[PDB]
């Protein structure tokens, strides 16, 4: 059950949801497995926020174990398209898809909590059918693999070769280690 | 069904749910298994209360049997980040994550009812796959154990060696016994 909060202004009292109240403050939540229904919801929020103030930054909280590649790219393209900078904050865990959307934030505005965990790996998939069809899907997923690595290297600042070798299998990176790799810029510990 | 209560104010009477009414009094409820969905809900409540009054303490009730570690490390990082002290009151049961989130409260503002039970154990996991991947996942879970063991020693005051010898297997502690280890500070029995 989502609790209801009150917002006091000189227009009248308005009762808001905890999630809806934070949306007014340029805060978007990315929770759970990434899929098409939730991805389109996040996309709608981004387009709505830039209408109110296309100059202020948009905060995106990422706590997810990963998800569909297509759904994530929808959010990635939307982030890099809108004029305002998207600040990514990692709380809890950030998997392959969560990490890609984490490092995709604006340079210098990517944060991670001290006990947060990050994971990166190559995309998964599979297809059952004729051999000719398998080759079609086999080449398609490979293109995505290379495309994701190229984008990952661009934001992290690493070389494409290093990303491929490191993403060959699961690689767990803590908050201090993610800073060296380039997935994030700083770590938030206390409110200073 | 959640009962609805009324609150009398100068502007007039307003109807809110029981949980929302208590939220106005800086009271957050942590019930059931810990997951990403409920964790983000608690994080939002903590952030909302901080903005309203960053100098008033926050009360967090803990009647949970445990859950995901990552979901519980976001709440912990959020409590240590916000300026106001987060008081923790154990109500009935406090497992690994609940106890970890019970001793993480502000020193001097931790409580445990007289007939409450606290249980501390080591992180549980498991992975199925190639031996190379098993090693990667095995090393990571061993880091979380050491990381969580160190945080508990800092908040309880016990030596790291003792925590390692006491968390190897399930350790049940009553409220009077928790006061001697450091998980809590005092026991609430009556109003005065």
């Amino acid at each position: 059950l989502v609790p209801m909060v009150i917002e006091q202004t000189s227009r009248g009292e308005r009762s808001f949801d905890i999630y809806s109240r934070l949306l007014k403050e340029r805060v978007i939540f990315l929770t759970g497995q990434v899929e098409d229904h939730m991805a389109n919801l996040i996309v709608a929020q981004m387009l709505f926020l830039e209408a109110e103030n296309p100059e202020k930054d948009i905060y995106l909280y990422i706590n997810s174990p990963g998800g569909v590649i297509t759904a994530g790219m929808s959010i990635y393209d939307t982030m890099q398209f809108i004029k305002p900078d998207v600040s990514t904050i990692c709380m809890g865990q950030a998997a392959s898809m969560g990490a890609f959307l984490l490092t995709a934030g604006a340079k210098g505005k990517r944060f991670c909590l001290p006990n947060s965990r990050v994971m990166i790996h190559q995309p998964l998939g599979g297809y059952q059918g004729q051999a000719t069809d398998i080759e079609i899907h086999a080449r398609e997923i490979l293109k995505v693999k290379g495309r994701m690595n190229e984008l990952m290297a661009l934001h992290t600042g690493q070389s494409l070769e290093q990303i491929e070798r490191d993403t060959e299998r699961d690689r767990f990176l803590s908050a201090p280690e993610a800073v060296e790799y380039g997935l994030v810029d700083s770590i938030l510990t206390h409110r200073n | 069904l959640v009962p609805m209560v009324i609150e009398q104010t100068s502007r007039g009477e307003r109807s809110f749910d029981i949980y929302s009414r208590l939220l106005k009094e800086r009271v957050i409820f942590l019930t059931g298994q810990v997951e990403d969905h409920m964790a983000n809900l608690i994080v939002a409540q903590m952030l909302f209360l901080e903005a309203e009054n960053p100098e008033k303490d926050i009360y967090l009730y803990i009647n949970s049997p445990g859950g995901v570690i990552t979901a519980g490390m976001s709440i912990y990082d959020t409590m240590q980040f916000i300026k106001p002290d987060v008081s923790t009151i154990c109500m009935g049961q406090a497992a690994s994550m609940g106890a970890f989130l019970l001793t993480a409260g502000a020193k001097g503002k931790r409580f445990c009812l007289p007939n409450s039970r606290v249980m501390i154990h080591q992180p549980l996991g498991g992975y199925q796959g190639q031996a190379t991947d098993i090693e990667i996942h095995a090393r990571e879970i061993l880091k979380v154990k050491g990381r969580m063991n160190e945080l508990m020693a800092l908040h309880t005051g016990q030596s790291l060696e003792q925590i390692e010898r006491d968390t190897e297997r399930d350790r049940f502690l009553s409220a009077p016994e928790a006061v001697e280890y450091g998980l809590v500070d005092s026991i609430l029995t009556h109003r005065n």
Binding site: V2, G12, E13, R14, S15, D17 | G12, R14
Partner: peptide, 22 residues
């Protein structure tokens, strides 16, 4: 003696509107 007299005001209230998830 020329002296002015004040008058009360409308005394309007501030209504509230509640919003639910759906």
């Amino acid at each position: 003696e020329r002296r002015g007299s004040h008058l009360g005001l409308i005394e309007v209230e501030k209504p509230l509107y509640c919003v639910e998830p759906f």
